[PDB]
């Protein structure tokens, strides 16, 4: 089952015109929310702009993230010194079976995981000296822990609940990859075969290579997103000078009923 | 810590000369988040270029997608030029149409 995760980032010295603080919100691999401190307002992204939604939804995303914003800038003061620093937080809930909500709150500083907010003991904590610095600075603030507890135990899974009921089509969206298999001589004696998958959702996809029907390995593979929320995948393999054409490509994806064979034709 | 960007160039839909399309630069796996990226058409900047939010992965490194609407053509090469703390000079990755 799905997740709702907020990606939070703040920086001690943004470029001019850059925000100090910005959040991307994600339902599964699909981004539904944008917020940055410059604009100071939460926005839907993609189809989610057109979701049939309770009228106060984006007011309440905005109010919560402004609180998160103040705390993140506050971390920097409390954090002794001149950095520059980058504070990242991964805050979200996962919905398993039984309608039961598991929570997550991990934090990273200058690209390193160093802190977390424990929900059982309502607490920020970590081993790093700077974990203690921010930790007590957040603890010593009125209401912080309570708002955090609220956001992840109630707000979060509620929001996930609402999107699963109001954005069913959006989450259940399936679009098969357009496929190509091509060849280019790599070196003397050799060719490079590249199997390529265009415009697919969901992101989960596997590609294999076959010689005459029997496995030849996966290529060397790469994934990436498109701008419309769809995805791209590609894989490449080295093969002999002129055989070469006793080869096909095998793609597996949820948007198909059965695996699809891609011939070099 | 510091992490150097991975760069991937490809088009939304399979490339066909004369047919309209989108071109993507996907820059990922990098830290810190400061980054500069241009798409190039035969050596020089594409003007109107959009990008997604600067977001990040389970491993905490950042990722970004740049894109622009375009019409491929027999006469045209494209690339992505990226600048970042971890590089001494801009890395340029040529768009392989098949990729």
């Amino acid at each position, epitope marked *: 089952h799905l997740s709702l995760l907020y990606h939070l980032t703040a920086v001690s010295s943004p470029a001019p015109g850059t925000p100090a603080f910005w959040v991307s919100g994600w339902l599964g691999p699909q981004q539904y929310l944008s917020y940055n401190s410059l604009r100071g307002e939460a926005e839907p992204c993609g189809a989610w702009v057109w979701e049939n939604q309770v009228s106060w939804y984006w007011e309440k995303e905005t109010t919560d993230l402004r609180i998160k914003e103040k705390l993140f800038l506050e971390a920097f003061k409390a954090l002794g010194g001149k950095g520059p620093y980058t504070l990242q937080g991964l805050l979200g809930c996962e919905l*398993g079976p039984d309608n039961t909500s*598991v929570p997550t*709150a991990k934090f990273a500083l200058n690209g390193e995981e160093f802190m*977390n907010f424990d929900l059982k003991q309502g607490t920020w904590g970590g*081993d*790093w000296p700077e974990a203690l610095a921010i930790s007590q600075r957040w603890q010593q603030q009125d209401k912080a822990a309570n708002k955090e507890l609220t956001f992840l135990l109630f707000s979060c899974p509620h929001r996930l609940r609402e999107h699963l009921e109001r954005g069913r089509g959006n989450l259940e969206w399936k679009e098969p990859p357009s496929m190509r298999l091509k060849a280019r001589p790599s070196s003397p004696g050799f060719s490079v075969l590249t199997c390529s998958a265009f415009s697919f959702y969901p992101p989960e996809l596997q590609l294999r290579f076959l010689r005459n029907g029997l496995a030849a390995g996966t290529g060397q593979g790469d994934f990436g997103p498109n701008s419309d929320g769809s995805f791209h995948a590609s894989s490449s393999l080295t093969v002999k000078s002129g055989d070469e054409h006793h080869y096909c490509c095998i793609v597996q994806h949820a948007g198909l009923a059965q695996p699809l064979r891609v011939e070099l034709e | 810590i510091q992490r150097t960007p991975k760069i991937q160039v490809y088009s939304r839909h399979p490339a066909e000369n004369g047919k309209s399309n989108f071109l993507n630069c996907y820059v990922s796996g990098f830290h810190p988040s400061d980054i500069e990226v241009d798409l190039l058409k035969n050596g020089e900047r594409i003007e109107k270029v959009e990008h997604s939010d600067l977001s990040f992965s*389970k491993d905490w490194s950042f990722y970004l997608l740049y894109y622009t609407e375009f019409t491929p053509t027999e006469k045209d090469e494209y690339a992505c030029r990226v600048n970042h703390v971890t590089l001494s000079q801009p890395k340029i990755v040529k768009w392989d149409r098949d990729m």
Partner: antibody, heavy 116, light 113 residues
Framework: VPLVESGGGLVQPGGSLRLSCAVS????????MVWVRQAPGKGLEWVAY????????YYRDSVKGRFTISRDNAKSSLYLQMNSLRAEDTAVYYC??????????WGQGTLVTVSS | DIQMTQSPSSLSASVGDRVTITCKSS???????????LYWLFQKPGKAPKRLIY???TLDSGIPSRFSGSGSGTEFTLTISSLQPEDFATYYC?????????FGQGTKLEIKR
């Protein structure tokens, strides 16, 4: 009182066992998790580690092909599937945290004894 | 494969005494934002381990303030300023910087009466 490990017991060489670690002390989803073991009346020994997500794992290489750490954040608990067991695997097995508070939370252990 | 080796393996000392335990790693342990992932654990017989000091010298909550650690590179020490009789246990040092992830053989600490 933060954890409880379970499912130890007596088994033959070759046999298999599944250790469970029920975390209720802290928010399990935040923590890399670790298995550590102690052969009866001897020093502590590191065994395995897992990502909080669940998609990165490490093992001592006297165990690589044979054991398998895993987690179900859903039931905030952690597992060790041990197969192809032999004599030296006899130990009390202890469940702890990895990043970001490595080795801070502990339980009573569970005894796994391997003999014919 | 990065060995931890403690000195001594065994020790009986008198209440009031100042105790010194050393931990020698075969390879340096700094390697982050100047964070050293060395740890001290202790274990009483029939009991589970507990964490004493984390990073190099940070006492865990409720660890009696007479316990302390220091060192930096490859040379580490646990120090009990004034021994008391509950201090009996086995102590271990633990490197947590590169897998594995290894313990010292332990120092068994008994109390002399």
């Amino acid at each position: 009182v933060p954890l409880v490990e379970s499912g130890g017991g007596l088994v033959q060489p070759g046999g298999s066992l599944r250790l469970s670690c029920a975390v209720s002390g802290f928010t399990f989803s935040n923590y890399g998790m670790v298995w550590v073991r102690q052969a009866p009346g001897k020093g502590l020994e590191w065994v395995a580690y897992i990502d909080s997500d669940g998609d990165n794992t490490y093992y001592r290489d006297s165990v690589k092909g044979r054991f398998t750490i895993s987690r179900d954040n859903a039931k905030s608990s952690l597992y060790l599937q041990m197969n192809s067991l032999r004599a030296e695997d006899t130990a009390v097995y202890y469940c702890t945290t990895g990043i970001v508070r490595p080795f801070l939370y502990w339980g009573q252990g569970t005894l796994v004894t391997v003999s014919s | 494969d990065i060995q931890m080796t403690q000195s001594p393996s065994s020790l009986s000392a008198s209440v009031g005494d100042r105790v010194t335990i050393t931990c020698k790693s075969s390879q340096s342990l700094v390697g982050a934002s100047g964070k050293t992932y060395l740890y001290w654990l202790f274990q009483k017989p029939g009991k589970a381990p507990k964490r004493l000091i984390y990073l190099v010298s940070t006492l865990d909550s409720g660890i009696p303030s007479r316990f302390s650690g220091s060192g930096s590179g490859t040379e580490f020490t646990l120090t009990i300023s004034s021994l008391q009789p509950e201090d009996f246990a086995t102590y271990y040092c633990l490197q947590g910087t590169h897998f594995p992830h290894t313990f010292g053989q332990g120092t068994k600490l008994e109390i002399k009466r």
